[PDB]
Design an enzyme around this catalytic site. Structure first.
Site, mmCIF file in Angstrom:
data_model
loop_
_atom_site.group_PDB
_atom_site.id
_atom_site.type_symbol
_atom_site.label_atom_id
_atom_site.label_comp_id
_atom_site.label_asym_id
_atom_site.label_seq_id
_atom_site.Cartn_x
_atom_site.Cartn_y
_atom_site.Cartn_z
ATOM 1 N N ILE A 31 23.627 -9.844 -37.706
ATOM 2 C CA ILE A 31 22.171 -9.766 -37.852
ATOM 3 C C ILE A 31 21.617 -10.828 -36.893
ATOM 4 C CG2 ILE A 31 20.162 -9.585 -39.404
ATOM 5 C CD1 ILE A 31 22.062 -9.480 -41.855
ATOM 6 N N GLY A 32 21.849 -10.626 -35.604
ATOM 7 C CA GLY A 32 21.409 -11.557 -34.576
ATOM 8 C C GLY A 32 22.327 -12.749 -34.417
ATOM 9 N N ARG A 33 22.974 -12.848 -33.239
ATOM 10 C CA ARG A 33 23.891 -13.932 -32.871
ATOM 11 C C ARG A 33 23.152 -15.266 -32.719
ATOM 12 N NH1 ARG A 33 29.147 -11.676 -32.613
ATOM 13 N NH2 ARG A 33 29.609 -13.785 -33.379
ATOM 14 N N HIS A 35 21.866 -18.470 -31.536
ATOM 15 C CA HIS A 35 22.361 -19.498 -30.622
ATOM 16 C C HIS A 35 23.646 -20.087 -31.218
ATOM 17 C CE1 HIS A 35 22.046 -22.742 -27.638
ATOM 18 N NE2 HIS A 35 21.313 -21.862 -26.956
ATOM 19 N N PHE A 36 23.630 -21.371 -31.635
ATOM 20 C CA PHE A 36 24.770 -22.019 -32.284
ATOM 21 C C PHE A 36 24.632 -21.932 -33.821
ATOM 22 C CE2 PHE A 36 28.033 -23.742 -29.512
ATOM 23 C CZ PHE A 36 27.466 -23.684 -28.255
ATOM 24 N N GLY A 37 24.232 -20.741 -34.268
ATOM 25 C CA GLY A 37 24.029 -20.350 -35.657
ATOM 26 C C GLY A 37 24.023 -18.838 -35.742
ATOM 27 N N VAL A 39 24.141 -15.114 -38.053
ATOM 28 C CA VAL A 39 23.742 -14.440 -39.284
ATOM 29 C C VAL A 39 24.491 -13.107 -39.332
ATOM 30 C CG1 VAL A 39 21.821 -13.619 -40.762
ATOM 31 C CG2 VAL A 39 21.509 -15.664 -39.357
ATOM 32 N N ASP A 151 7.361 -25.306 -37.679
ATOM 33 C CA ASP A 151 7.612 -24.194 -36.746
ATOM 34 C C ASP A 151 7.150 -22.828 -37.268
ATOM 35 O OD1 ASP A 151 8.412 -22.842 -34.363
ATOM 36 O OD2 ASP A 151 10.526 -22.786 -34.975
ATOM 37 N N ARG A 155 7.952 -15.080 -35.518
ATOM 38 C CA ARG A 155 9.414 -14.978 -35.351
ATOM 39 C C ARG A 155 10.186 -15.537 -36.553
ATOM 40 N NH1 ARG A 155 7.955 -18.773 -31.557
ATOM 41 N NH2 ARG A 155 8.235 -20.906 -32.341
ATOM 42 N N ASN A 156 9.525 -16.426 -37.328
ATOM 43 C CA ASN A 156 10.070 -17.112 -38.496
ATOM 44 C C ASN A 156 9.588 -16.506 -39.788
ATOM 45 O OD1 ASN A 156 11.868 -19.060 -37.398
ATOM 46 N ND2 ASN A 156 10.173 -20.446 -36.935
ATOM 47 N N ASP A 169 12.416 -20.021 -41.860
ATOM 48 C CA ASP A 169 12.709 -20.799 -40.660
ATOM 49 C C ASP A 169 14.122 -20.489 -40.246
ATOM 50 O OD1 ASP A 169 12.776 -22.631 -38.496
ATOM 51 O OD2 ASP A 169 11.771 -24.226 -39.610
#
Ligand SMILES: Nc1cc(Oc2ccc(Nc3ncccc3C(=O)Nc3ccc(F)cc3F)cc2F)ccn1
Length: 293
Positions: A31-33, A35-37, A39, A151, A155-156, A169
């Site tokens: 469910i979306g790679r 960045h360095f996290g 899902v 933030d 997008r959040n 977030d």
């Protein structure tokens, strides 16, 4: 290195613990790679038999325990976030392998920005004002708990099967990594964030909603946004944005932070604007904003 964490963080995580038997992470289904996290799609077993759909956030893993402690705090910060317009925490799974796992209810429609950008979707003025109102309700709740987002952007914001918006977030002194285009004047100048600066961000979020997810200030370089704003500028009124909603955006962008409406006042004002619409006015994408990143 679980014992080198923090006993108060560990006891707080213990009350929201998910056993590694009751959670199946589908690592193949991303469910979306990001960045360095990362899902992933997940299946969670609740109480008895119940096969609930969930999103599992991970990654993994350089600094001794510093990034792990911060990751667990971000998830534990959600514990008292129980509001229909704020994303919930199902719990945290402690892997006997590596990175701990943050478990969230699955949001069928994903993020609010990609949802409104989708050209197969046909929102009306009412639907978009509706989304803005739901974000205001979530923010009203967060502000009452003295929680500062920092933030807030489309997008959040998450969207579920019933089209209920869940504020969420996804995820350095003078170095850039900041969402400057959603930032209040005082927050760009000093580096302090308040509920009043979330109110500035909310105004930009309303602009994203009314333009169907156009990027704010496209022509403007990130490093010179303060210079641009101080010339006496604000985002233009979107083509399908009603005048009283634009006036609300200009109030969110008040140069005096303390003169900005509170989220309680924004809920009131937006709820009135929303009640006047019947679902007759369709919002179309702007040709000057298509494929613009
Ligand atoms: N398709 C889909 C995709 C999803 O992706 C995620 C979206 C947001 C988070 N967010 C978080 N992940 C870990 C810790 C905290 C948060 C979070 O959003 N915290 C938070 C909540 C409300 C706030 F106001 C501020 C916050 F920081 C995690 C996801 F996997 C999820 C579901 N469905």
């Amino acid at each position: 290195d679980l014992s080198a964490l923090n006993p108060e963080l560990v006891q707080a995580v213990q009350h929201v613990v998910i056993g590694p038997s009751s959670l199946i992470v589908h690592f193949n289904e991303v469910i979306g790679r990001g960045h360095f996290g990362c899902v992933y799609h997940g299946t969670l077993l609740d109480n008895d038999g119940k096969k609930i759909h969930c999103a599992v956030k991970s990654l993994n893993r350089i600094t001794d325990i510093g990034e792990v402690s911060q990751f667990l705090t971000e998830g534990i910060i959600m514990k008292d976030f129980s509001h229909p317009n704020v994303l919930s925490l199902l719990g945290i799974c402690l892997r006997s392998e590596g990175s701990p796992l943050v478990v969230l209810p699955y949001m069928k429609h994903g993020d609010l920005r990609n949802f409104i950008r989708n050209e197969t979707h046909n929102p009306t003025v009412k639907d978009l004002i509706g989304f803005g109102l739901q974000v205001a309700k979530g923010m009203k709740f967060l502000a009452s708990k003295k929680f500062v987002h920092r933030d807030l952007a489309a997008r959040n914001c998450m969207l579920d099967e019933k089209f209920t918006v869940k504020v969420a977030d996804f995820g350095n002194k003078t170095g850039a990594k900041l969402p400057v285009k959603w930032m209040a004047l005082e927050s760009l100048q000093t580096q302090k964030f308040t509920t009043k600066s979330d109110v500035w961000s909310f105004g930009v979020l309303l602009w994203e909603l009314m333009t169907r997810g156009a990027p704010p200030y496209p022509d403007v370089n990130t490093f010179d946004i303060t210079v641009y704003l101080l010339q006496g500028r604000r985002l233009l009124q979107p083509e399908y944005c009603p005048d009283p909603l634009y006036e609300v955006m200009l109030k969110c962008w008040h140069p005096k932070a303390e003169m900005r409406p509170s989220f309680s006042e924004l809920v009131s004002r937006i709820s009135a604007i929303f009640s006047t619409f019947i679902g007759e006015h369709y919002v179309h994408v702007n040709a000057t904003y298509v494929n613009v990143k």
